């Protein structure tokens, strides 16, 4: 065999180091530098500009076929240019060539900042830019990125020696394959012989399909490769190396170990004899089970048993390990850092958890200790067993803090925990309370996993309830803020806040400055930030330190059910990590199994941030069982009755509906749901997105009835945030200053609200903006679409939601201004109408029903407890409390500054009445089994719509549900059918479209009199109906002795 090996020449030096006024620029002849031929530079050149970006140069020449500047001089290892400057700060544009052909076809940019003695060199067909000719040398002939791709046993897809003749899997146990000292790469090594992708592998990684194939014996020892550092190398015939990069190896950890490994259970397993621990570490080269007491002290420390079929670790100890704090010690190799790291950490299957998550606890979650007295006879008080069930379902989307933190009936040490939901005469309590009997019928939950980004060490963390004294004490910016003189104030952090709203403008954005301090220590997160996927948060239990939190969380999920009478939903964040790498304190997964749990570049290996942080890899298979095995314990221990997944685009299609079936084994009932946008990982795999999802039973949102009712979208910016009015805020029929919104855009809109009131269902046909037949996939959203859905219940419908701006937000930016406050208020119950009386699952932030405001807001997760407020006392709805932050809502200042002040702030006539029309309408929603028909044929069969097409009265939305006979049977005993009716526009309008039938006013809208929705909605003796401005009727045929003919849909 040949010996690999770099290049016969030594790693160079610098040719010339640059002056005063001076930049030197190398160019590395890698192909020159394999000799032959001592090869000529007399064509090489640079092209020299400045700009307005780098304007360092003295007399560049701007003339692109001037080839005149060519090299200073040259040695061996290639030519380097002496540039002058007029400064020795900043930075020069370079672009490097041969003639006029750009050898580097990257505009180069050469920082003086970055390179501090102007001396860099560059290398043909690569864009970085070295501080030294052996860096760049290195780079050429080293290891480099990690585009191999070891995916299974005999498989290894890389193009780096694709028609190479020498091409081969290197591997070293303990150290980094560098060439040894007789420039040799000496290291142990498999050879590869190229091949043809199989069809399994192709089908498995088809972003990878097109690499270049190579075998490997199909005897190799892939367990002792995989100990250490892999290295696919390649090189001529001569043996001079060509190219080295490190492996990916998830596809073939999981051709290799997964089958076994999946059989097994994982976490601290308390068995009839004793505990057993199990950890999946598949390269680790030792793991060592750490037992710690109480205080932290190592009291036990036991080498683990490999497994070598599955790759699994584990240990068996007595039952008197129930409650011990543990962590794995872990000797693994981490392909970013090119070490066989040393370090601790949590269990990923972790149940319990000390502190702020710095140890893993064993626990029995079955331990009658850890549970509320009743908690093994608690009762779902929702059916979500058939679809009718489903469509039923009406969320409340809300978080710990926003529930309590500001509630001064909540005992003090229960603001911000789970425990607040047990204050039974709380004003939150007895408030969520009249939302359940209303018709609310389910809390969501954001984030109470263990989040990673509050610190649960209390004396770690201000809140603004307390002295302001405690945030200087903890914020040590706050002494070089333009706030240090408030240390002494004596006067709370909310206080202050308060004070800074009187002088707080677009041009004094005082409040949100001392607010960004404030979000740096408190105790205030959304919390999409993953420590551990399966314990209950920290910070929301009065004790963090063990297995308090989980009694806690329970003791919250019982007092919703069994006291408000509602649901639970989780939400849920399986596509990333909070932190990657062997360094980061949150790093578990990436520690324990480098480079198997986060999804990677293909070419660099860098971990993936497309969802914000560190993208997870469902598609890989213990990854996928981490995700199942942690559901199962919400669904089991925790009694979750549905979850909603984050980003469910960026997992497989396969994968969700996978977990799907293996959840439904443990409760029939429960329901999955999630955000089914583009991840761009369809390359990869079917991703669970909106359309992909359609007939599987799995809900997404639908941003569709969304942004017609809104108006605009949520990236929108400064003037277009007013000119993008939608139905709700008077699109086309009450117009603003800025809009040019058209009649034709407007009725598009209204398209879109319909078909999401019928569920947004591909099939449904109704007559579109311009009196054509169209199916609901027919009806273009941005290009996609519309409709996509095969039954409602695969739709949630919405009009707010915790991110991106509140409708009450969206209503103050685009409301004309001749619509006064209480025309406000009805655009809101208006908006939320045509979720509350549609077909499709209805969601909606917290605090909808209190016309809540986060200050014009657009992403408040780090925001606070002051923009996020919800006040229960009824005083205000958080209007105008500061100017939002800047970072993220400074381009809106100005068109914030125009529309603000409109008119007044709702104070507590106005939630009282905003409260009343939301429990009218959630009242509406379950007064019928036909707002609810749960399955897609049956809407399609008995939904209908009026006032259709280019000549309808813009704005009135009108929704027939037939229960007559020309559908099926009479679903609801009391009436033949349902009239919906939504004026949002205004003028009064009148129906002709049922005069003639015994058409009237539900008892619900009549009951609630002059307080209704529908106050003042007249029905003549002729069956004519006559509708006030910004108005929502429910009308019905009463039934007769038999069905009757009803509202037969027609057939188009
Ligand atoms: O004013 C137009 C322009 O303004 C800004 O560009 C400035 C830029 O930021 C400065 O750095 C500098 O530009 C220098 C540039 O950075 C260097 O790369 C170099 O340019 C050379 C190229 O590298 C080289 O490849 C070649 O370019 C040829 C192209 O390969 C070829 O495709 C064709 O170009 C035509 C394009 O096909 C066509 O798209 C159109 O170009 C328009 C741009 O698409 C459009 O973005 C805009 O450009 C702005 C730009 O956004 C700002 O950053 O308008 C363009 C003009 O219509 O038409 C092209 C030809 O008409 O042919 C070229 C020429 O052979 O050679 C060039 C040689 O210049 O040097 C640049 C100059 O030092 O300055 C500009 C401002 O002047
Ligand atoms: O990842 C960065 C991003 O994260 C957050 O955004 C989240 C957002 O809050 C959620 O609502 C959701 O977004 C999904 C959305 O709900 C769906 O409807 C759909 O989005 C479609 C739109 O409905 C549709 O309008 C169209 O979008 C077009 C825009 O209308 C148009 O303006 C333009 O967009 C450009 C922006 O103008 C420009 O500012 C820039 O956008 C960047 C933002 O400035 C920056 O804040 C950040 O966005 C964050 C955001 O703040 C978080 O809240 O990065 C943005 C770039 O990614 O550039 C835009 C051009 O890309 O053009 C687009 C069409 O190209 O189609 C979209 C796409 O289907 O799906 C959305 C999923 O992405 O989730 C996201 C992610 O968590
Ligand atoms: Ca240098
Ligand atoms: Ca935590
Ligand atoms: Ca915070
Ligand atoms: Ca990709
Ligand atoms: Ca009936």
Known sequence: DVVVRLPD????????????????IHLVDIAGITSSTPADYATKNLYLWNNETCDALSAPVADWNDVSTTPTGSDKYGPYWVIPLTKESGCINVIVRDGTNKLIDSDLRVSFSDFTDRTVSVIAGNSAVYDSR???????????????????????????????????????????????????????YVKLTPTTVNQQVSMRFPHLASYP????????????????????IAAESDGILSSATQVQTAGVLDDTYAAAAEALSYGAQLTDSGVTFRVWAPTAQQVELVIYSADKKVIASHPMTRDSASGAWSWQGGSDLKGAFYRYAMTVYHPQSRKVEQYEVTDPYAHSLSTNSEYSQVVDLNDSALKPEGWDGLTMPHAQKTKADLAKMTIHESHIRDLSAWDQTVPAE????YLALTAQESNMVQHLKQLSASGVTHIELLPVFDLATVNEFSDKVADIQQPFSRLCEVNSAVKSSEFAGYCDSGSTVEEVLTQLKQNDSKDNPQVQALNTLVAQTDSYNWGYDPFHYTVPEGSYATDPEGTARIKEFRTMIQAIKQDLGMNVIMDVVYNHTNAAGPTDRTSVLDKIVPWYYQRLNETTGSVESATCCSDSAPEHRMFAKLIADSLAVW???????????????????????????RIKALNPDIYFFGEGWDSNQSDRFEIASQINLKGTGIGTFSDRLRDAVRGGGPFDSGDALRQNQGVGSGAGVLPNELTTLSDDQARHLADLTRLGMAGNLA???????????????????????????????????????????????????????????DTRVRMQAVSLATVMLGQGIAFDQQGSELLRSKSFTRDSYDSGDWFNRVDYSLQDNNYNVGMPRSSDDGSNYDIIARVKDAVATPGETELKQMTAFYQELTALRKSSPLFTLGDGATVMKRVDFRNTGADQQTGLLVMTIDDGMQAGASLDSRVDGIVVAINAAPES??????????????????????????SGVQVAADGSVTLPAWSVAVLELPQGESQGAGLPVSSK
Do not use: C
């Open 9 to 24: 020449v030594a790693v160079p030096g610098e040719a010339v180091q640059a002056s005063a006024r001076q930049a030197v």
């Open 134 to 188: 052996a860096d760049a040398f290195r780079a050429a002939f080293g290891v480099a990125l990690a585009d191999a791709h070891w995916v299974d046993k005999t498989t290894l897809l890389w193009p780096g020696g694709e028609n190479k003749p020498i091409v081969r899997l290197y591997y070293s146990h303990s150290s980094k394959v560098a060439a040894d000292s007789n420039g040799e790469f000496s290291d142990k």
């Open 213 to 232: 194939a190579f075998k490997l014996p199909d005897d190799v020892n892939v367990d002792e490769l995989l100990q250490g550092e892999t290295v696919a």
């Open 414 to 417: 229960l603001r911000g925990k």
């Open 635 to 661: 669904t089991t221990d925790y009694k979750i009755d549905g979850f909603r997944f984050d980003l469910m685009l960026y997992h497989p299609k396969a994968q969700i509906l996978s977990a799907w079936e």
């Open 763 to 821: 099939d449904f046909v109704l007559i579109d903006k311009d009196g054509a037949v169209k199916r609901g996939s027919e009806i273009d959203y941005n290009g996609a679409p519309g409709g996509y859905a095969a039954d409602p219940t695969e739709v949630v419908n919405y009009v707010s939601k915790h991110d991106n701006q509140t409708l009450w937000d969206m209503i103050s930016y685009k409301a004309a201004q001749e619509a006064d406050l």
């Open 989 to 1014: 309008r009148t129906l002709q479209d049922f005069a003639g039938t015994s058409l009237q006013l539900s008892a619900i809208q009549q009951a609630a009199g002059d307080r209704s929705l529908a």
